[PDB]
């Protein structure tokens, strides 16, 4: 036979790095729906807000 498509290259192993950064940890709520063959996806972020006066 004769073919060739894609190769493998090992990079790392499954391990939990405790010193990883937690920046960008937005727990956004995404509502995905479709109506007429298209798909409509809204994303609702719930950012915390402390009151402030000017």
């Amino acid at each position: 036979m004769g073919s060739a498509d894609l190769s493998l290259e090992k990079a790392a192993n499954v391990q939990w790095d405790e010193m990883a950064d937690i920046t960008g940890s937005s727990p956004i709520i995404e509502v995905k729906q479709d109506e007429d063959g298209s798909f409509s996806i809204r994303d609702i972020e719930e950012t915390n807000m402390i009151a402030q006066v000017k």
């Binding site: 894609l6 290259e9 790392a12």
Partner: protein, 163 residues
């Protein structure tokens, strides 16, 4: 052949380019559908042939069924072992959101890594893969969000007493 995280390279005119990421665990190589699209993957030992796929959920397994059974529990921090092309492996932790869709709730990872990372493992605190990074959604020029791509429990309530 050995358990770990593998880069999925494609030979071209200018050499091999990382098109995606895959995880070989418990003797089965797990990756994303849109990455390999069913093409066989060869390594020193031999060529891997696909065994199962879910095109709607963008998943495909090589050499057997999906053995990654661990799913994400809500309100628990996860880490993405992003394998960016050329760059070294990078671990980033996040508090996942939710993908409110018909048929269930899928974890929403807000991390935006470079293209080609599709298939990077999503690991829980116990050091086990609970999903795959790569299949997600982008906002209007905004922050990409990837769904925690996992096979089983794709539509189950995850709170019943039956199993």
């Amino acid at each position: 052949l050995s358990e770990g995280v593998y880069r999925i390279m494609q030979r071209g005119l200018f050499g091999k380019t990382q098109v995606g990421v895959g995880i070989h665990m418990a003797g089965v190589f797990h990756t994303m559908w849109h990455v390999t699209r069913g093409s066989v993957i060869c390594h020193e030992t031999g060529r891997l042939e696909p065994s199962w796929a879910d095109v709607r959920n963008d998943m495909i397994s090589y050499g057997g069924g999906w053995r990654l059974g661990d799913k994400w529990d809500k309100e628990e921090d996860v880490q993405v072992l992003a394998i960016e092309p050329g760059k070294n492996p990078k671990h980033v932790q996040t508090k996942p959101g939710l993908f409110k869709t018909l048929t269930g709730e899928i974890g929403a990872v807000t991390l935006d890594f470079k293209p080609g990372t599709s298939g990077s493992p999503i690991i829980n605190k116990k050091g086990k893969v609970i999903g795959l990074y790569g299949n997600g959604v982008v906002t209007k020029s905004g922050d990409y969000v990837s769904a925690i791509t996992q096979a089983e429990r794709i539509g189950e309530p995850d709170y019943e007493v039956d199993e």
